[PDB]
Amino acid sequence: ILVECLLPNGMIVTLECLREATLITIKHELFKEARKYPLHQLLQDESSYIFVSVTQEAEREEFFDETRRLCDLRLFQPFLKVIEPVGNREEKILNREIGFAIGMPVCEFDMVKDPEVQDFRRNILNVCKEAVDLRDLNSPHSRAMYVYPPNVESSPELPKHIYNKLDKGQIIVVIWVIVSPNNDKQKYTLKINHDCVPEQVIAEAIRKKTRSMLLSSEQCVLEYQGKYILKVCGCDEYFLEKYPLSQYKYIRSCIMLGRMPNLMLMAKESLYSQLPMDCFTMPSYSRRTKSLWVINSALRIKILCATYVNVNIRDIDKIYVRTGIYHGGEPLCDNVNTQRVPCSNPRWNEWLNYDIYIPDLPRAARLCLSICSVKGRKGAKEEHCPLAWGNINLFDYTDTLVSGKMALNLWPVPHGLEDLLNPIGVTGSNPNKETPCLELEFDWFSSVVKFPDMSVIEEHANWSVSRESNRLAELRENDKEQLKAISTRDPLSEITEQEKDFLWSHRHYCVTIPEILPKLLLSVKWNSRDEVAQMYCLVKDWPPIKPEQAMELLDCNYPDPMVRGFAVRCLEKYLTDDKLSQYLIQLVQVLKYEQYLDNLLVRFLLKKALTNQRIGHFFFWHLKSEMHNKTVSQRFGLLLESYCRACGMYLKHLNRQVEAMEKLINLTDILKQEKKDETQKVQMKFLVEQMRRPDFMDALQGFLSPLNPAHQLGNLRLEECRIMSSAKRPLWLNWENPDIMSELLFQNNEIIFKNGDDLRQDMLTLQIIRIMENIWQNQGLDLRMLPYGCLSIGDCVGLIEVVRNSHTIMQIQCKGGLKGALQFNSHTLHQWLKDKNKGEIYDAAIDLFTRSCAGYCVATFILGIGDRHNSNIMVKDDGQLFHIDFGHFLDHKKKKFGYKRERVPFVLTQDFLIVISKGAQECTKTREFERFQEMCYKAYLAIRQHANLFINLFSMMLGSGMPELQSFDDIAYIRKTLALDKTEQEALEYFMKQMNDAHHGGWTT
């Protein structure tokens, strides 16, 4: 490459440098040819200089790491400048690694003048300190505990339906001891109780080993050596904690499937040396009046002008600014509009007046506003359409009321949004300056105005009752029943004014029913000072509640900091690691509902992600997948920078995964755009040419799988990598497993790379399916679902786990002959199931098929996923059936094309019924069919009994950006599909009627 080089003496030299050349060679040959040019004697020594240049990301990144290659620098232009080092080398090396991991440079954080951002950067380091220090407290044990956390479940108690799978409460395990003189491996079958801790398992394994190994006659103290640990064969899972063996996820899954639990006996010191020290250091940037309740004036905000709006003068007549004071999604007063002005001169200079006093403003009060246009004209006038929107916190992060001039840059209206205002949306100005900007003025009250401290608020309570129709103040039993009845209601139930007044009038007895707190919080008028003070006094001493219900308090309906702090404390004291892992997506999503960067929830999440690497991996990937969206780019970037600073040497693995995903993204973007007008074979030849280069091979081999960090992806098998002919241009990639004994788990790991389709809907659907399966298995129903792995890594790009030995129904019906009008006898599925397993395993195959089919029928009907055909449903060899390619949910394909109420997505065709009825010509009148119907009914009722959790989980993704989830009206679909307003009997009847109306079969009792 014709790189032109800049020497410090004004010397300019052209140096021909190879693309695969390290910076050491570049420096050496740069000073080698620096002798034939003018002023060479004045040049200093070669080792006292470094390379600085500009990258494609528009920063001047000094090249303190000379081991990098020329192409990896991402140069904007092929040039290098020779300078002298001025700062700390390792700090900038770490900063560059963080910048690569994050997707944007660290320095542009330092170039931010918002005091909140710098305060967050300085203050999150304390949590980083505590996490890193706790991780190092008991080295080397705590370090391995952090790197390889136990994959256990919440409770050691064993469900009764699988305790009977045990042989008298005992487990068969196969322990593999790799003595390896060269490679030799042995096995030891053992019989132990399900509740033994791994120390006892190791003790019994060594007892078996020290009985017949290298001796057959008698000759520390032969028991409890303590020098070994347990490892799952074929993957990076370890049993390092004192838990019952059945509590580990791998063991209990083996019990579920009746498989053979394979384990290994590694040495303690080998694993301890397998992981390095964490050298975490603080960076450079760590080196560093009247109350609101004394202002007797109604709130008013001036709207000065707007710089520009993008409308046409021949279509839009006039424009106006519509404002409103909100607490969450609930207005605190009526909305106020400005006057109507022509679009050419958007100047108002108007003092808007609001119907709320200043001391009555809640701490989380926000001003929401939008520029809107009025079409009008003709008889049907008043056609309003918003153009831009924005929200401002009326208090800053230091509890100070806004004052003075303020310039706000607004955001584009989200797709499929009709309401004039957008209170759900995030706060803050648009970082882009080529946007409509609205100038506002706030009142100046001769000093700085602060929200009152908790002490004076507590003073206000216990006094408000003295001054002052059953509110504003031994409790009858008919009231007690009413409180419980309200408590059992779903969070999106109808709450009447009478019910709200009843709840508030009995707030001092609501404490004995701790689960009623969300309703009581929705029953207080947040525009009243004394009511909020009393609510604060109640929340201060509220009994703890379950994480299931405390998570509900973190959605957009409860913006008050005290309520969110109570919810975060409940999460701190009750939420387990596996439950946190199951619910991490929603907890990440509800970070956007926080008004300030430094909050208790972000501290709790970062502390958890720095003490548990499994949690931290998905934390990083969930934050990184939505760095493209500018509404959350800064907050997520700051949080991710802190995490990457304090994570340790997991940053190298994360960096490797980022390079792999970037190379895959570039390849898919090339083949999906330049090769639209091409056949698949030439694309495949091109693609194997692309993997032929050593650079892409090195980038795509030897890194941890983002879907499961415990899985290592070794070399790429190019003979088994292909481009699918399905929708978009997905990539089938096959990796070898570098584990010593991959044959026990799986030899090959296969992942689909999809570029073009959103995967957040699929991720949410699979999470819901996994939760449904867990509820069913705990209830006593063995409905086995297959919630395969799916991860979104960026904007419309993600990874999908592949299930081996699976075929679509179309694949079977095509491989079994017949075509088109030839009905395949509707027996091809049953014939294939008979063929692929025969004998005594046949009955188990139909049993598994029936249970999985029932589970998926109930789940698909409840979630309202897109219509199912023979190409998005797959069945394994053993009989298990599962759905793929979820796409949409809650209809959302209908509701715009028409009415299409409560459609059944997965209708049982005849082909499935003959499988369930085991070859019976008539299927609906058999005992198998009614057993299947009973299983479906029980699954539906079991899910209905846990409707609150599903409603709450759906309510946390409202601000995520999925078009299916923009308001609670979208969750009304779930509310009505479970018949939540009806009672249990009519809900069961409604489900049977729904199944009848799509089958015309025997779905009536």
Binding site: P38, F76, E330, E383, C385, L387, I495, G898
Partner: protein
């Protein structure tokens, strides 16, 4: 009125709406004045319950009507013979009597007769026309959105390229400054030895640096002009969407109104959904 008594039954009442959900009530009450009300059946489907939705303070307040021994009331005691009598009593007297904090009266009914201002074959053909226009406007709209998103991505890339050009030109200008500073004490050396060729090969490098920095400035200027043009197109696309949106919304509302009117008339949906 006309009957001046309870003779206006529940079906005859303009404010009673029968079987509607929360979503439709919220749609009808959106951004309405204080005192806008409509009465619907209770969502739990028991006969004679009824629920009243009232607009106050920008929020939809839900008030439940009770029904015991043929009487109706907002709470105990129940003193009204029907719900028409209670709704009229609170249309003429403020609701602050029932509870002081609801200082509002029942002002503005949401009439179910007001939607009839705008022959099954004829209405079916009209629905087909409206649906066709809606589909055309919708495909125009989302192709505009795709164009707009791609334009925004190009604009962001070109802005980043502008910043990179600025950094590169600054670096080259500091290099020129360093060359000028270093030329002070060393340029007078090749005037005693009689070798002006050394000064010539000195000036060669400076001329090359000046040519390179001028070329970089030219590239930056060209890319800035392209950025200006692309931002102009971005504004034009935003204007065109702003024009497209309200007519599309109104046309969708008209199509939905026609579909609802035709569906309630008594036709099976098989004949309607076949034509999409």
């Amino acid at each position: 009125n006309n009957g001046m008594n309870n003779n206006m039954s529940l079906q005859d009442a303009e404010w009673y709406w029968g079987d509607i959900s929360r979503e439709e009530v919220n749609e009808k009450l959106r951004d309405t004045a204080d005192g806008t009300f409509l009465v619907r059946d209770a969502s739990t489907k028991m006969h004679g319950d009824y629920t009243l939705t009232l607009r106050k303070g920008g929020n939809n307040k839900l008030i439940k009507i009770f029904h015991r021994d043929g009487k109706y009331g907002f709470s105990d005691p129940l003193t009204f013979s029907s719900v028409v009598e209670l709704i009229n009593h609170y249309r003429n007297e403020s609701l602050a009597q029932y509870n002081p904090k609801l200082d509002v009266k029942l002002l503005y009914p949401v009439s179910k007769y007001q939607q009839d201002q705008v022959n099954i074959e004829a209405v079916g053909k009209k629905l087909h026309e409206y649906n066709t226009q809606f589909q055309e406007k919708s495909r125009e709209y989302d192709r505009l959105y795709e164009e707009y998103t791609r334009t925004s991505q190009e604009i962001q890339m070109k802005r980043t390229a502008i910043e990179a050009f600025n950094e590169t030109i600054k670096i080259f200008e500091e290099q020129c400054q360093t060359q000028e500073r270093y030329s002070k004490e060393y340029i007078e050396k090749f005037k005693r030895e009689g070798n002006e060729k050394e000064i010539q090969r000195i000036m060669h490098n400076y001329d090359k640096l000046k040519s390179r920095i001028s070329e970089i400035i030219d590239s930056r200027r060209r890319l800035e002009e392209d950025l200006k043009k692309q931002a102009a197109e971005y504004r034009e696309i935003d204007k065109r969407m702003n024009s497209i949106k309200p007519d599309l919304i109104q046309l969708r509302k008209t199509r939905d109104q026609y579909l609802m009117w035709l569906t309630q008339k008594g036709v099976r949906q098989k004949k309607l959904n076949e034509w999409l």
